[PDB]
Structure formats: C-alpha cells, structure tokens
Design a protein around this ligand. Structure first.
Ligand SMILES: Cc1cc2nc3c(=O)[nH]c(=O)nc-3n(C[C@H](O)[C@H](O)[C@H](O)COP(=O)(O)OP(=O)(O)OC[C@H]3O[C@@H](n4cnc5c(N)ncnc54)[C@H](O)[C@@H]3O)c2cc1C
Ligand SMILES: Cc1cc2nc3c(=O)[nH]c(=O)nc-3n(C[C@H](O)[C@H](O)[C@H](O)COP(=O)(O)OP(=O)(O)OC[C@H]3O[C@@H](n4cnc5c(N)ncnc54)[C@H](O)[C@@H]3O)c2cc1C
Ligand SMILES: NC(=O)c1ccc[n+]([C@@H]2O[C@H](COP(=O)([O-])OP(=O)(O)OC[C@H]3O[C@@H](n4cnc5c(N)ncnc54)[C@H](O)[C@@H]3O)[C@@H](O)[C@H]2O)c1
Ligand code: SF4
Ligand code: SF4
Ligand code: FES
Lengths: 276, 468
C-alpha cells in the first residue's frame, strides 16, 4: 500500500489564528464539483453533520479545498486533525451551482472565510471571460489574514481591511467608493449574514443586482428536512437544494439572522471539549 | 370476554417515558408457545388474506408450536425479508390479525400473529446465525440500487442471491431509510437494522454510503454503467403547511426532529455532537405514526407537556393502535378535530403560542373521505415552546426529472407496474413509497422482492416490457 485513502486530509495549513485551510482527498467529490456547491461532513461516530464549502478542486489528483473558521466544537476538532487523518463522512457536492456566463464587469465582495467560498465563483467568472473587481475584508490584517494570492492572480483586487491596506473598515464602504468608475449589473456577497445583508443593502448601487451565498443551519443537506429553510421573496426555499446562492434582494435577512441564532446552547459541547 | 392475547413483557410507562429502550420486550419461548396454541389452524385461513404479501401464517405458527423454530424462520423468510421489523412495526390491527377468526368470536382478540413473526425472527436473530456466501458473483449483469430502505435492502438482497452484481447507493451515513432515521429505538431497535445490513453485506452486496444519486453520481451515469437500476428512494421532502409563524425558531418538520433524534441521536447530547432545541410544552401536528413517534421522541427529552393536534377524530387516526396507547401511557395528550392557524413568536425569536380552531363534518368528499370544515368562534390559542409538523411527505422532484422518459403519477410519484415494478425507462425498476406514496414497510419489502425477480427475468432475456 503506502498511499492516499478516502477522505484523507492531504494538506493542512493554518492561515490565521482561528482560521484553517484544508486540502482533502476525495476523487468523486472533486470531480463532480461545480462552483457554488458545498459538502456536508462528519468527523467521528458521535459526530455531527456540518456544511462547508468547496473552495477549489483538482479532479486529476482528486483533491478539494476547504477553508474553515473555528467558531465552535466541530470546526475546532477538524483543525486539530492532522495530515494523514481521515474525515469519517464526506457528502457532496451539495447545493445548486453558480450561474456562470460571460456577462461583463463583475464586482465580488467577501469576508474572511467566505472569501474561500467566493473564490471558485471568481475563477469560474474569469473562466467565462468576466472582468472582475474584487473586495477583500477580514477579521484583522496579517494576524487574521485574507488570501491575496487568490484574487490578485485571478483579477484586479481592492483590499478593504479593518485598518490597513486600501480603505479602512467594512467592505460595503469599498463598494460605496465605486461612485465615479463603477460597473454594469453584478455584485456578489459571501461572508457572515450581516455582511451579505449589507452588500445587498448596497441597493443604491448603480442598479446592479446581487448574488449571495447563504449560510443557514443544515442537517442532511439533501433537502429532506428543512433546517436550512429560507424565505426568498415571499415564498419558502431550501438553501441546500434551491440554494445556497440566491439573489440578495429576494433574501429575507432578518429571519435568517434570527434562525442562525436558533441554537445558542451549543456552547456547552464547546466547553466540555475545550477542557481537553 | 374470553379469548384475549397472551401478555408479553413490556416497559413500565413511567420508566420508559424518559429513555429510548424498546417498549415491547418480546415473547419468551413458553409465551410464544402459549400464543401459538391459540391458533385454530383454519383450513381457509383468512388471516393470510389480511397479509399484504400473504405470508403462510398458520404454517409458521404451527411449526412454532411443534418446536420446530428453524422451519418457522424459513417459512417466514420465503415470504418476507424483514420479519423482525414487520413483527414490530406492522399495523396488524388493520391487516392480518384484523382477519383472524378467533377475533370474530364474541368479544375475543385475534392470535398475536405479528408477535409470533417477531419472536421467530428475533429468537433466530439475537443469538442464532445463518451462513456465509456471497453467491452474487454468479451472474454477469450489474444492478444499481438507489436507497437502502426496506425496498432497496430487499431488492439488493434478492438480486445478490440470484447472482447479479449489486451496488446499493445510500445518501446518509447509516443504512437505511426509515429503519434508521425514521422510526425510533423504542419501536425498532437499530441492532436489527444493522444486523440485516450486515447480513445483506455478507451476501456480497456493495454499500455506497454518503452517496447522493444525481449529485455524488449523476443519474445518466447510473444509467450508462449499469444493466439494471432500481429506484427505491422512498418519499420524504417533507411538506410544510405554510401557515404564518412557520419560520419561527422551535418549529420543526418531523423529518428534522427525528433525523436529529434517531439518526444523529440528539438525546444522547452532549455525547453525540448534534444539538436539539428545548421543549417543555411541545405540539405535534398530525396523528400518523410519524407524528406519534415524534411526540414520543420529544417527551423523552424532558418535555413537561406534549400535545397531539389532529384535524380529524380518533377513529380516523392512521397510527398503529398499540403505539397510540403507548403514547397515551407516556402521558401524551391528544386533541382531536383541531387545526392550527398560525404560530406566535416573541421579539428574540421563539415559538410561544399557536392559534387554532375546531373542526366538524359537513360535506361528503371534497378531499379525503370525511373532509373536515372549521368552526367559527372555536378559534383559540395554545401555549407551546416547541412545534413539530408531521402532516406528510413527498417524492424527490428534482431527482426524478433527471431520469429521461420517466413518467410520474397523479402528483409526482413514479408510474410503475405494480407486479413487475418496470417503469417507462428500459431496464429501470422502482418500488416502495416512491411509487405508492405513504404506506407500509412490508409493502416496500414486497415491492423489492417482486422487482428483483423481474429484473432477473429481464436480464436473462425471458421478459421485456420495453419494446418501442
Ligand atoms: C453551504 C454552507 C457552507 C459553509 N461553509 C463554511 C466554510 O467554508 N468555513 C466556515 O468556517 N464555516 C462555513 N459555514 C458555516 C458553518 O457550517 C458553521 O460555522 C458551522 O455549523 C459551525 O459549527 P461548529 O463547528 O461550531 O459545530 P456545531 O456544534 O454544529 O456548531 C455549534 C456552535 O457553532 C456556532 N455556529 C456558528 N454557525 C453555525 C451554524 N451554521 N450552524 C450551527 N452552529 C453554528 C454556534 O453558534 C455554536 O456556538 C457554511 C455554512 C453553509 C450553510
Ligand atoms: C416516522 C415514520 C414511521 C413509520 N411507521 C411505520 C409502521 O409503524 N408500520 C409500517 O408498516 N410502516 C411505517 N412507516 C412507513 C415505512 O417506513 C415506509 O413505507 C417504508 O420504509 C418505505 O420504504 P422505502 O424504501 O420506499 O422508503 P425509505 O425507507 O425512506 O427508503 C429511502 C432510502 O433511500 C435514501 N435515498 C433517498 N433518495 C436518495 C438519493 N437521491 N440518493 C441516495 N439515497 C437516497 C434515503 O436516504 C433512505 O435511506 C413509517 C414511516 C415513517 C416516515
Ligand atoms: N455564507 C457563506 O457562504 C459562508 C462561507 C464561509 C463562511 N461564512 C461565514 O464566515 C463567518 C465568519 O466571518 P469571519 O470570521 O471570517 O470575519 P468577520 O465576522 O469579521 O467578517 C469578515 C469581513 O466581512 C466584512 N464586513 C463588512 N460588513 C460587515 C459587517 N456589518 N459585519 C461583519 N463583517 C462585515 C468585513 O470586511 C469583515 O472583515 C462565519 O459566520 C461563517 O458563517 C459564510
Ligand atoms: S385465522 Fe387466526 S386462527 Fe385461523 S389461522 Fe389465521 S391465525 Fe390461526
Ligand atoms: S407481515 Fe405484517 S401482516 Fe403480513 S403477517 Fe407479518 S405482520 Fe401480519
Ligand atoms: S439541510 Fe435539511 S433540508 Fe436542507
């Protein structure tokens, strides 16, 4: 033997304090993956199902990229996993792929880890011949860093730190400072729900419509229960089957924000874990 | 009056209400023998007519009383792949024991046929083992089975024995279907399901877990790389009523609640990493087995009050009668002829209440035999901090569309021959809830049996429904 096994963690890299980037060996998932899609994983037998985005794929070598923020137990445990370790369950690719054509001038906005989700979209847009302007925000500067090697290699990048390069603070301010120049009819927002809400609230805009990648609570990820329930326009959609990407104008943000806080008692399993 | 069923060991209501161990403990051998002597061995045996697959009921009961338990298991196994399940979960009240003549005597109960099937299956399951195999390397043809529920497991098992290459593809991490994520441990112990899976696994069947067909592997790949395909995906969407307050925190589909509780084991939290919301007063909408198991799952989580809320009367409740009583024994309260109008939430987000009305009978058959119409001024409110909606389920609409030429029924289920299981697509078969809609395990089993047999017949060239 002496080689790569199913769902092996091939490369692990710590790119920030509580942010970890994974390259995982899964030939099928890597081959069948379309931009905008995600996977649902389970670490151990007692483990839980959590959704995480595919950040990139190399089908020829059967690998897929994923970048994770540590906000609690499962993301923590995954970060503590070492090279050679396997993830117990990996199901994907789930969700509906991004709608990729040759539109025109496109604006992309992303936050910390959501940038990873925002990456294969960028590549795919640039794969379709779009001229992109990308906005990068993060938790901090190089203490918690955002991937420059992705965007600058893939497009012209405007860095919107919370007090460093480019403008200083929220990324909606960088979208705001288009003004004189600007572009024709597309904006993308991937990050925490608040940021995606605001990039939608760019509504002033130049009359440019927003695509957004939602992040609700998921269980199966196959559209079998409705945990990921979202109200688009006035009607109910499932972000695992109908999404995860929707049009921000039609997205109900307040209700999604309310639902992402639906389980806040979950801190308990973080504490019993953090003792060890 | 006189002839009633033989009592079996059962968990006390007060002790079992907080844990998930099985309620019905099962017959001892002497108890099974006592019950078996009650069978009158009717030459016409109407009991058989009450069974969906017409198991030779007086036969296995007779071999049981004769102390020949080995023959009894094989008699059952000729008709039914999953007897340790059906003995537990079959609605015998409306099927086989509903046709038993000793029940037709004046104020007498039928022979506990389900319990005897359960006994023979369990007696030979808990301890006794069978044999090794695989024989599934005999034939040339490869078959793809989609779904590891009762249907897919049965179909795969039968096809493997016939010598064909069998690949089961399962979306979840544990096989399979309702037997793992649907029906709770206190009704169907998972040891039985895991056992059968290993048994089918020992027959040489390959399980592709964590594989969503149409996503992990495309439909047109399954059709390209396989000789036959069985669609046993079952049906669970689920269906939301859509009333106001549906998006509130604390409102659940029975799918999510039970998937968390059964498959993800949120009641063993924080041993298992899957959490569930608190529910001191919980309302479950519907009176089916899905609603009944959900409510019963909820009470074991430390619920102070659990309510059943149902549009129709008691007699119209589809749930298994024994389990209806079990729910009552655990303290669950039933509200008949009550229909929810909206859910009331607080500022922080949480379900505090529920607006409801009462119902009655007026029209004949607008939709559903006794179609219920609400009553004005019957409108009231119920205070609940948790809500689980179990009003039904549906087929997978996107997945079926990826099958070219596949014809659906009245409202989304696959058009498929009842006996052969053959659809409008060459070489493709289907069975279970994906065809009939909501139904029984034994029927899903049977469909798997029949489809497997005609896949064999088709792959040998003898029979071909697809000509033009
Ligand atoms: C399509 C999709 C793609 C995603 N991709 C990424 C990604 O690439 N990188 C990343 O860091 N995150 C991603 N997320 C969000 C991620 O799923 C949550 O952060 C994750 O559930 C965190 O759970 P946990 O590790 O703490 O374990 P859990 O015990 O399951 O979560 C409990 C703790 O985590 C907190 N928490 C934060 N978000 C969630 C959430 N959605 N569900 C449940 N609990 C949450 C809870 O407040 C609680 O403290 C994605 C979500 C979706 C729907
Ligand atoms: C709560 C509940 C309680 C019930 N209680 C009883 C009872 O007491 N007595 C009785 O007789 N009947 C009962 N039933 C009904 C019985 O469980 C079903 O009728 C029977 O299981 C149908 O078998 P099936 O294979 O058609 O569906 P399922 O058992 O649901 O099989 C579906 C399987 O296929 C998988 N699958 C689905 N789609 C895909 C896909 N695209 N790709 C890969 N895998 C897929 C699913 O993950 C699942 O594992 C109950 C049902 C439910 C939901
Ligand atoms: N929706 C998705 O597809 C997706 C994918 C991965 C991660 N996420 C999410 O990433 C989140 C964590 O974010 P983070 O730790 O990387 O950093 P973070 O919370 O500080 O947000 C990162 C950047 O978002 C920009 N931003 C603009 N307005 C903002 C606002 N009003 N509030 C917050 N941020 C604003 C900022 O530039 C900020 O740097 C998670 O909650 C996870 O759910 C979402
Ligand atoms: S009917 Fe009741 S009694 Fe007559 S055979 Fe079937 S079981 Fe034995
Ligand atoms: S299968 Fe269900 S119905 Fe047929 S016998 Fe066993 S129990 Fe009675
Ligand atoms: S995750 Fe349960 S239906 Fe989307």
């Amino acid at each position: 033997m002496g080689g790569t096994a199913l769902n092996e963690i091939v490369k692990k890299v710590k790119i920030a304090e509580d942010v970890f980037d994974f390259w995982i060996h899964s030939p099928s998932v890597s081959k069948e993956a379309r931009p905008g899609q995600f996977v649902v994983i389970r670490l151990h037998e007692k483990g839980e199902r959590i959704p995480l985005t595919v950040a990139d794929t190399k089908p020829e070598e059967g690998l897929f990229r994923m970048v994770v923020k540590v906000v609690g137990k499962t993301t923590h445990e995954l970060s503590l996993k070492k090279e050679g370790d396997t993830i117990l369950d990996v199901v994907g690719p789930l969700g509906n792929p991004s709608e990729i054509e040759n539109y025109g001038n496109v604006l992309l906005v992303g936050g910390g880890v959501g940038i990873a989700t925002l990456y294969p979209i960028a590549k795919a847009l640039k794969e379709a011949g779009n001229n992109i302007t990308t906005v990068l925000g993060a938790r901090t500067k190089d203490y918690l860093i955002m991937v420059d090697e992705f965007k600058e290699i893939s497009d012209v990048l405007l860095v919107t730190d919370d007090g460093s390069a480019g403008m200083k603070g929220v990324v909606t301010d960088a979208m705001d400072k288009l003004f004189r120049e600007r572009k024709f009819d597309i904006c993308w927002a991937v990050g925490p729900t608040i940021m995606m809400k605001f990039c939608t609230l760019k509504a002033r805009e130049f009359g440019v419509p927003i695509w957004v990648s939602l992040n609700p609570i998921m269980v199966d990820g196959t559209g079998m229960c409705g945990a990921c329930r979202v109200t688009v326009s006035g009607q109910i959609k499932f972000a695992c089957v109908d999404g995860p990407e929707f049009r921000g104008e039609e997205v109900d943000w307040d209700e999604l924000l309310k639902r992402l806080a639906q389980y806040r008692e979950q801190e308990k399993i973080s504490y019993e874990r953090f003792l060890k | 009056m006189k002839n009633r069923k033989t009592p079996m060991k059962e968990q006390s209501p007060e002790s079992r209400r907080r844990n998930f161990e099985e309620v019905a403990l099962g017959y001892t051998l002497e108890e099974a023998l006592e019950e078996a002597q009650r069978c009158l061995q009717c030459p016409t045996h109407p009991c058989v007519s009450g069974c969906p697959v017409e198991i030779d009921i007086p036969g296995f009961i007779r071999k049981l009383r004769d102390g020949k338990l080995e023959e009894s298991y094989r008699i059952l196994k000729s008709y039914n792949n999953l007897p340790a399940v059906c003995g537990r979960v079959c609605p015998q009240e409306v099927q086989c024991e509903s046709r038993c003549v000793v029940g037709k005597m004046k104020d007498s109960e039928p022979v506990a046929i389900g319990r005897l099937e359960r006994f023979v299956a369990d007696w030979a399951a808990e301890n006794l083992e069978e044999d090794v195999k695989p024989l599934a390397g005999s034939k040339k043809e490869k078959v793809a089975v989609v779904g590891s529920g009762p249907a897919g497991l049965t179909a795969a098992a039968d096809l493997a024995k016939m010598g064909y290459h069998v690949d089961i593809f399962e979306a979840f991490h544990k096989p399979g279907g309702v037997l793992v994520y649907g029906i709770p441990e206190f009704r169907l112990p998972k040891r039985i399901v895991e056992r059968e899976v290993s048994y089918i696994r020992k027959l040489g069947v390959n399980f592709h877990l964590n594989t969503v067909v149409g996503k992990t592997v495309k439909v047109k790949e399954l059709l390209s790389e396989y000789d036959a395909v069985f669609i046993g995906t079952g049906a669970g969407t689920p269906k939301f009523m859509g009333i106001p307050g549906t998006n509130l925190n604390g409102v659940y589909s029975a799918n999510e609640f039970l998937t968390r509780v059964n498959l993800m084991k949120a009641y063993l939290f924080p041993e298992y990493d899957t959490p569930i919301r608190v529910g001191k007063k919980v309302a479950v909408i519907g009176a089916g087995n899905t609603a009944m198991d959900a409510a019963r799952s909820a009470l074991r989580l430390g619920a102070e009050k659990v309510y059943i809320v149902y549009r129709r009367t008691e007699r119209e409740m589809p749930a298994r009668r024994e389990e209806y009583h079990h729910a009552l024994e655990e303290g669950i309260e039933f509200l008949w002829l009550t229909l929810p109008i909206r859910y009331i939430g607080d500022a922080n987000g949480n379900v505090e209440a529920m607006e409801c009305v009462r119902m009655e009978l007026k029209e004949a058959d607008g939709s559903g035999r006794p179609r219920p119409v609400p009553i004005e001024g019957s409108n009231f409110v119920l205070e609940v901090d948790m809500v689980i909606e179990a009003i039904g389920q549906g087929p997978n609409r996107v997945l079926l569309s990826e099958f070219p030429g596949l014809e659906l029924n009245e409202r989304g289920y696959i058009k498929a021959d009842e006996d052969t299981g053959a659809t409008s697509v060459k070489g493709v078969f289907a069975g279970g809830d994906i065809v009939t809609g909501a139904a029984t395990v034994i029927k899903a089993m049977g469909a798997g049996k029949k489809a497997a047999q005609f896949i064999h017949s088709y792959l040998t060239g003898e029979w071909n429904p697809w000509q033009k």
